[PDB]
Amino acid sequence: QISVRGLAGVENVTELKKNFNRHLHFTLVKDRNVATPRDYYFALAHTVRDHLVGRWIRTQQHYYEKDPKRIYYLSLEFYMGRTLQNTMVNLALENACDEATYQLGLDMEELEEIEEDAGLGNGGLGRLAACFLDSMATLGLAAYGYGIRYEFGIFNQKICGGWQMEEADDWLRYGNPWEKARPEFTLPVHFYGRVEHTSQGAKWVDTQVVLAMPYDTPVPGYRNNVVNTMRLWSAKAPNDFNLGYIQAVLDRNLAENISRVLYPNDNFFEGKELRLKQEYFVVAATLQDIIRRFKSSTNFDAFPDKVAIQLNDTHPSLAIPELMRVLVDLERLDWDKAWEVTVKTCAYTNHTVLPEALERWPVHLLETLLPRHLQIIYEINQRFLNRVAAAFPGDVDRLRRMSLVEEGAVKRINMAHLCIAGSHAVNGVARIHSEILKKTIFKDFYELEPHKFQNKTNGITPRRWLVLCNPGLAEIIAERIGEEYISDLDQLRKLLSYVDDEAFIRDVAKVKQENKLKFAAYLEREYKVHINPNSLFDVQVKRIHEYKRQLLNCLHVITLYNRIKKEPNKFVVPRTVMIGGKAAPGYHMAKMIIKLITAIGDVVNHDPVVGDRLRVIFLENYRVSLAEKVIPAADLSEQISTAGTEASGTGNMKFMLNGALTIGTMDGANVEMAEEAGEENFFIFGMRVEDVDRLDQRGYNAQEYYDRIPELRQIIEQLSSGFFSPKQPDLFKDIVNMLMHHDRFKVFADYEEYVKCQERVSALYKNPREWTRMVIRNIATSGKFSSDRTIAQYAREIWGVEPSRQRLPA
């Protein structure tokens, strides 16, 4: 069908069809009279997985023989999504399977829709993990993702009467054809117990044992025959466990609960024991696996030349005292030497500066659960604070600020402080974010060790986020410049000499129109909701958080509605405003925000005066596979975090890649996107970081905006008075209250400039042709935002390994 989806050679198609029928008969134990479309999905999925395995085995073999430095990416989240289409794209099988399945009388696309998302993440942090893995394999690095195999991932979101309801995400119900259980590599992990001191050193004893059983998932590189491994641990009880006989067997579940469920908090710390067990679990089991692999090559000086461990935020920060524990207590190296190895091995990536998101573990927790690690942490803190003392003599306030140990109410360990002390490199995830670390929360650490601090601006994989979700756009780009851009995204610059080409202008507009027709139809079929496809598609999708200011967007929507009612017969550029995202379960304000959005939709969508000029849709169950549909269909990308709060953002990059214009604050990667496209090709508004700081020190008084801006006062009164909630007049008193008296994110301060920048957007949209040329200018400069670039920088500047675009033999 389309040229970027590979060859459909007669030999391949005939071969695919017979393996499909074999799996249906032998693996699935069905015949064609009883098979449902789900069985068809599995047969296709098993048939596609056969193509990986040979490559997977050879790649693991090549690494054994060639013995390169290995990268270990430790993360509590891997937000993978579906694997089938991605696997086909990376093996060039897409058109062959399309053809093969067509001939069997099946629709491949209808089959793809049956696959469950692997939702083993919350949002951006877990999704960066997934892009990173795809990029490591594409660049031929000998790289292993390590995490937890959660039985339940991020919950499924349902809306009932405008409120979010949470349902268990039972993603394994039908089986997962992508994983291979490896019970032969089960490893013990210890908890509780106590520390004995001997002649021979410390010993950790009387521990409970949880077993960690690994599951391997293949991660294929783009068309290079590399297939790396994502290893996820599952918790299993030992067999003498407790060993009522009955009750002892039933209690085996208290051990296995460690890997049962992903914690649904995003940018918010919760200090729960079960979460700490999860953190230790992945770290303890992964380090033994790493040491084991290293011993099959006694002399640990070469350890840092054979091993890099990346920490995906502070979730796996216990890797640091754990590496020490093993090195000092079990291998019996002296402190100083183990410490050199540790620092040289480990590196730390920070993903936020929000105070409520940082990990600070109560000492009484570590004390019970991990008494040895606490001793090690105390020792680390003591020797660290002696370097600080020595370099800044007499500065006693520095010592209390830098301490890994926080005093006060209950003593806590600051886990970020631990990571900085124990890593040779620390990085933020966009340039402005990295500067903020150096200027604010990590300032003291920077003056002590400037050479640790770096930036590695985030990116996204152009395989999932362009080829896979947007084949139409990929195809027209490939007609003009070839296919090489898919693994070298900088090549999109060449699209700049097509900015005045009339055929290209029309092709970009045509693709966008198709994606919108397809998305509108998906809204009607799967959610009985009616949208006008000629409207501007104004979309904000990401987790629900006050810092992301979904509330700012709400105020704009209500403003547009009020203007329509004031002058009904005046022309306005019509929009569909879509907003989506999950709220963490205990986060009451986020849940109120979701309810406000649908309340606004109840009023606006049923006003006959509005017609099809304005539509407000809340997109249910936002997740990876829903992003692959809505992103290509969007015209305006909303990236409107208060400046200084969005560390980087990655959705922003998804939208730029796929031909939507961006309205955004100078926050996070937005600053670098605008700089790449040129600020003229970007809808920038609102306070900079500097302005936010000026307003803080003076005092943020919301009443001031409410007094000076009549459009805003009318919205607040409408909110206060029951206009959007006629049966519960006082439903939104929490929101108005926070807006008026405790807004940490200054929603009013950006309101005026946001509404005005929004009119500039509608104006550009009235001129289809200039809208599209600006789109071409975005797409054409999105190259920097490939995770291949991000990973090459990690490889050269942190891991000390060289990337490779070379094919391995087939």
Annotated binding site for AMP: 31, 64, 292-297
In this chain, which stretch among 171-179, 328-336, 436-444, 505-513 interacts with its own copies, using CB under 8 A?
171-179
Out of 173, 528, 698, 742, name the contact with its own copies by CB under 8 A.
Answer: 173
751-765 vs 768-780: helix crossing angle, rounded to 10? 110
Binding site partner of 650, from its own copies, ligand D1J, none, Cβ cut-off 5-8 A by kind: ligand D1J
Nearest residue to ligand D1J, by Cβ distance, number only: 124
In this chain, which stretch among 76-84, 150-158, 196-204, 318-326 interacts with its own copies, using CB under 8 A?
150-158
Out of 17, 23, 70, 351, name the contact with ligand D1J by CB under 6 A.
Answer: 351
Binding site partner of 519, from its own copies, ligand D1J, none, Cβ cut-off 5-8 A by kind: none
Contact 442, 420 (CB under 8 A): yes
Minimum distance, C-beta of residue 54 to its own copies, in the bound complex (Å): 7
Out of 10, 14, 37, 38, name the contact with its own copies by CB under 8 A.
Answer: 38
Both structure tokens of 747: 């929603």
In this chain, which stretch among 49-57, 193-201, 305-313, 686-694 interacts with its own copies, using CB under 8 A?
49-57
Minimum distance, C-beta of residue 647 to ligand D1J, in the bound complex (Å): 4
Site map for ligand D1J, 216-255, x if CB under 6 A? ----------------------------------------
* Pairwise CA distance, residues 50 & 40, whole Å: 16
Minimum distance, C-beta of residue 350 to ligand D1J, in the bound complex (Å): 7
Residues designated as active site: 351, 542-543, 548, 650, 654
The H or E element spanning position 575 is strand 575-580
* Pairwise CA distance, residues 570 & 557, whole Å: 17
CA-wise closest residue to 62 among 170, 116, 142: 142
Minimum distance, C-beta of residue 422 to ligand D1J, in the bound complex (Å): 16
* Pairwise CA distance, residues 444 & 506, whole Å: 54
In this chain, which stretch among 12-20, 515-523, 645-653, 729-737 interacts with ligand D1J, using CB under 6 A?
645-653
Site map for its own copies, 236-275, x if CB under 8 A? xx-xxx-x-xx-xxx-xx---x--xx-xx-------x-x-
* Pairwise CA distance, residues 235 & 245, whole Å: 21
Contact 98, 104 (CB under 8 A): no
CA-wise closest residue to 778 among 447, 500, 492: 492
Residue 67: Cβ within 10 Å count? 11
* Ramachandran bin of 575, using left for φ above 0, alpha for ψ from -120 to 50, beta for the remaining angles: beta
Minimum distance, C-beta of residue 535 to its own copies, in the bound complex (Å): 35
292 counts as binding its own copies under rule CB under 8 A:
no
Q: Which is nearer to its own copies, 205 or 254 (CB)?
A: 254
* Pairwise CA distance, residues 33 & 35, whole Å: 6
Site map for ligand D1J, 261-280, x if CB under 6 A? -----xx-------------
Q: Which is nearer to ligand D1J, 583 or 719 (CB)?
A: 583
* Pairwise CA distance, residues 518 & 633, whole Å: 8
Binding site partner of 586, from its own copies, ligand D1J, none, Cβ cut-off 5-8 A by kind: its own copies
Count of residues for the chain?
A: 810
CA-wise closest residue to 576 among 610, 552, 544, 548: 610
Minimum distance, C-beta of residue 293 to its own copies, in the bound complex (Å): 14
Per DSSP, the three-state class of 325 is helix
Q: How many CA atoms lie within 13 A of 63 on its CB side?
A: 22
Minimum distance, C-beta of residue 187 to its own copies, in the bound complex (Å): 14
* Pairwise CA distance, residues 525 & 520, whole Å: 9
* Pairwise CA distance, residues 15 & 302, whole Å: 47
Site map for ligand D1J, 101-140, x if CB under 6 A? ---------------------xxxx--x------------
* Pairwise CA distance, residues 209 & 558, whole Å: 57
Longest dimension (CA), the chain: 90
Minimum distance, C-beta of residue 418 to ligand D1J, in the bound complex (Å): 12
Q: Which is nearer to its own copies, 180 or 744 (CB)?
A: 180
In this chain, which stretch among 100-108, 224-232, 296-304, 641-649 interacts with ligand D1J, using CB under 6 A?
641-649
The H or E element spanning position 111 is helix 108-112
> Which residues have a Cβ under 8 Å from the Cβ of 296 and sit 6 or more positions away?
none
Binding site partner of 313, from ligand D1J, its own copies, none, Cβ cut-off 5-8 A by kind: ligand D1J
Both structure tokens of 138: 């594409």
Site for its own copies in 209-228 (CB under 8 A): 216
644 counts as binding ligand D1J under rule CB under 6 A:
no
Start-to-end CA span in the chain (Å): 25
SS3 percent helix, strand, coil of the chain, rounded to 5, is 55, 15, 30
Q: Which is nearer to its own copies, 76 or 633 (CB)?
A: 76
Both structure tokens of 498: 């097509």
Site for ligand D1J in 647-666 (CB under 6 A): 647-650
* Pairwise CA distance, residues 139 & 141, whole Å: 6
β-pairing, 405-406 vs 360-362, is unpaired
Q: Which is nearer to its own copies, 252 or 518 (CB)?
A: 252
305 counts as binding its own copies under rule CB under 8 A:
no
Binding site partner of 654, from its own copies, ligand D1J, none, Cβ cut-off 5-8 A by kind: none
Out of 156, 352, 642, 681, name the contact with ligand D1J by CB under 6 A.
Answer: 352
When computed from its CA atoms, the radius of gyration of the chain, rounded to whole angstroms, is 27
Per DSSP, the three-state class of 736 is helix
* Pairwise CA distance, residues 450 & 348, whole Å: 15
Minimum distance, C-beta of residue 322 to ligand D1J, in the bound complex (Å): 18
180 counts as binding its own copies under rule CB under 8 A:
yes
Binding site partner of 649, from its own copies, ligand D1J, none, Cβ cut-off 5-8 A by kind: ligand D1J
Q: State the alpha helices, DSSP H only, in 605-688.
A: 624-630, 651-657, 670-677
281 counts as binding its own copies under rule CB under 8 A:
no
314 counts as binding ligand D1J under rule CB under 6 A:
yes
Minimum distance, C-beta of residue 44 to ligand D1J, in the bound complex (Å): 32
Contact 283, 322 (CB under 8 A): yes
Binding site partner of 807, from ligand D1J, its own copies, none, Cβ cut-off 5-8 A by kind: none
The DSSP result for 464-513, as a single string, is IIIIIT-HHHHHHHHHHH-SGGGG-GGGGGGGGGGTT-HHHHHHHHHHHH
Binding site partner of 359, from ligand D1J, its own copies, none, Cβ cut-off 5-8 A by kind: ligand D1J
Minimum distance, C-beta of residue 431 to ligand D1J, in the bound complex (Å): 13
Number of chain residues interacting with its own copies (CB under 8 A) = 50
Q: Which is nearer to ligand D1J, 89 or 429 (CB)?
A: 429
Q: Which residues participate in the annotated binding site?
A: 31, 64, 292-297
Q: State the alpha helices, DSSP H only, in 550-681.
A: 550-566, 588-604, 624-630, 651-657, 670-677
Binding site partner of 274, from its own copies, ligand D1J, none, Cβ cut-off 5-8 A by kind: its own copies
The H or E element spanning position 295 is helix 273-295
Please list, residue by residue across 567-590, b when 16 or more beta carbons sit within 10 angstroms of its beta carbon and e when fewer do: eeeeeeebbbbbbbbbbbeebeeb
Interaction site with its own copies (CB under 8 A): 25-26, 29, 31, 36, 38, 50, 53-54, 56-57, 61, 152, 155-156, 165-168, 170, 173-175, 180-181, 183-184, 216, 236-237, 239-241, 243, 245-246, 248-250, 252-253, 257, 260-261, 263-264, 272, 274, 585-586
Interaction site with ligand D1J (CB under 6 A): 122-125, 128, 266-267, 313-314, 351-352, 357, 359, 429, 458, 646-650, 668
